[PDB]
Symmetry: D2
Subunit: 213 residues, 4 copies
């Protein structure tokens, strides 16, 4: 349990063109770190910026302090699922779902990803994104369900940023104690990749906190 | 060509639960009318309001006057595709794509539909929708591509309305003459259905115009 | 008893990107024809440094032609009158909030208007005055928690072609209990017929008609 | 040369749902500690019929503690000063637009503030005064077309539990050419420490610190 495995498959489409990606990786749930290797199995070479997928490729790998209820770790071995809409400032929209289950010492994700209305001359279809900036998600309860909101941005090639609003709903398969309003800091990073992003090495890191004291 | 057939399959998911629906119907492209019969093949009985699907189940069945360029009819026999995001006022989001091709005298649609973040206590998951109100879409060109925007609403069971914003991108497979800014009036209606909407008879009607003279 | 010819008098005070201005207007309209016109004069803050078109839809649904079979919330509200509040969200993030308190003095409607726009970028069509006109639009009216609302997504045509979209969300509040209408539409067509060079003087016309949509 | 102790003086004029009000304030802050406090007095339109919390984040990033390795746009802008514009979009559709023109007179910052909120529903937490406080927040600052912007999605906690979300979009404009910063964050914590019953008098505190996010 201090060190775990991940294997995943994402099937989806962007602007109506389908693709599928599989990933293997591992992380340290108490340290709030994870890493993975993904390879495109269908729809390659991908005609859109890979960065729109990386935040879809699991909060159980977040470091939670003692004084904040950890909804995600407490959700296992049964697991949880999440749904997310990602609204980019030029009207591109990505909807994603992930069902996270646990197999002994391996989390397996079934992921669906669907993006529409990305303009041909925009940074996503023209692959002008560089990386996601570090972000701060706010988590809160709404009608007995845990939600997460974060407004973040991608840095662009010629400088400047491309904004996106995330709205996530988290659903444990069993009743879990709900946390108070709190935050989770994120840093997601693609360390290595081949020319057309057929191979991607992705690292993410996060920690929950309670904001300015 | 005055009277045509339609056959379609939609595969999708709502809040992560997958389903699939097939439809047969026919319409009169110059009269701006269409009708169809759909049956759920997978994921039934559907746990969400059927109304969120009906506007996804083809502008070629719109009556265009002489003085407005008809992008959609002019797009055949090669056809066109469209992408759409549907943003409901409580945060539920549906992304849809449709690739419309022509087989002799039959249009066939390949449809993908993905909705996320519909709350359990909302009108969609609680099936408290009645029908779509009549609507007026505005069509305009953006960077050489035809777009359509319409903000409409579903009537609810106890009275009141549930709003949704549509953003559609239309892409002909071949270069087609682009129209000027214009409007398309819509009325979509489910005439008949069985208890759990396994069977649905759907009718739609539309006409392009140029607004108040 | 609304008359076929009524008068309009108005004062708008406002600001765009923090720069204040004020405009006064006098006009006339035909409530049963759904038509109105007015002459507007900049009294403070001229010459206006932003596109005049962002103001024109703020310069009264009582001048919309309602058929007999649709409840007319606006004509019912007089002689006491009504007020409305509106936010206008432009696609580049410029936001305008406006309010109008409408009273009646004889055969003259009087408007007290506040207008505040923020976050219009210096290189955008509003601050660079690259707007041409509003396209015709279709507003949707509906009731929310006993209050009448109006929504419309429309657009301004631009100098070099193309359009600049805006979403309006309006709340209408009668000053007495009036019968509420069912869901319906109001088509709009607004036009600046003439103006002087710096838009210190503007002659504005509007045409509006209610309907029930595609039959 | 910003000092460790500076003074604040302000006047806000505004309206919510068309009802006007005005508030004057005097305060103090510690720019190198990222802390400030002020006493606010309602001068017109009292007793305010809306939740005071919608105003508090409008009542100056110069009082944010900036580390040496992040360019401080706000301290650089003085003595000439800077202005900002902001829209605040609440999840039930209430929208507030605000502007602040900040100048410096000796060791005292002077604010000229306009505030205009519309479309707050009668049964919502703002008009029913069911807000408790702002949660701590993290604003993201970035440059857009040579102009500094700030975005934050945050929330008010409510009387009966739960939260009421709001999205802020702010534009910051220095009154002279200053060096622009890279993408960074400012954490905020704002609190009403005391007030009289009808909020005619309010003592408000804010704490802010810039950082570069998760390392």
């Amino acid at each position: 349990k201090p060190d775990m495995k991940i294997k995943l498959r994402m099937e989806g489409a962007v602007n109506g063109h389908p693709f599928a990606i599989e990933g293997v990786g591992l992380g340290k749930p108490f340290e709030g770190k994870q890493s993975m290797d993904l390879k495109v199995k269908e729809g390659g070479p991908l005609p859109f910026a890979y960065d729109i997928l990386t935040t879809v490729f699991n909060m159980v790998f977040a470091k939670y302090p003692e004084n904040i209820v950890d909804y995600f770790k407490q959700s296992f071995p049964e697991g949880y699922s999440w749904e997310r809409s990602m609204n980019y400032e030029d009207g591109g929209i990505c909807n994603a779902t992930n069902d996270i289950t646990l197999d002994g010492d391996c989390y397996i994700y079934e992921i669906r990803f669907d993006g529409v209305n990305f303009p041909a001359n925009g940074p996503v279809m023209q692959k002008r994104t560089v990386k996601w900036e570090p972000s701060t998600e706010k988590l809160y309860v709404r009608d007995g369900v845990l939600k997460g909101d974060v407004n973040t941005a991608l840095s662009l090639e010629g400088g400047g940023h491309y904004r996106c609003d995330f709205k996530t709903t988290y659903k444990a398969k069993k009743v879990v104690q709900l946390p108070d309003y709190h935050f989770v800091d994120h840093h997601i990073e693609i360390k290595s990749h081949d020319k057309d992003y057929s191979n991607v090495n992705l690292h993410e890191h996060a920690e929950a906190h309670s904001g300015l004291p």
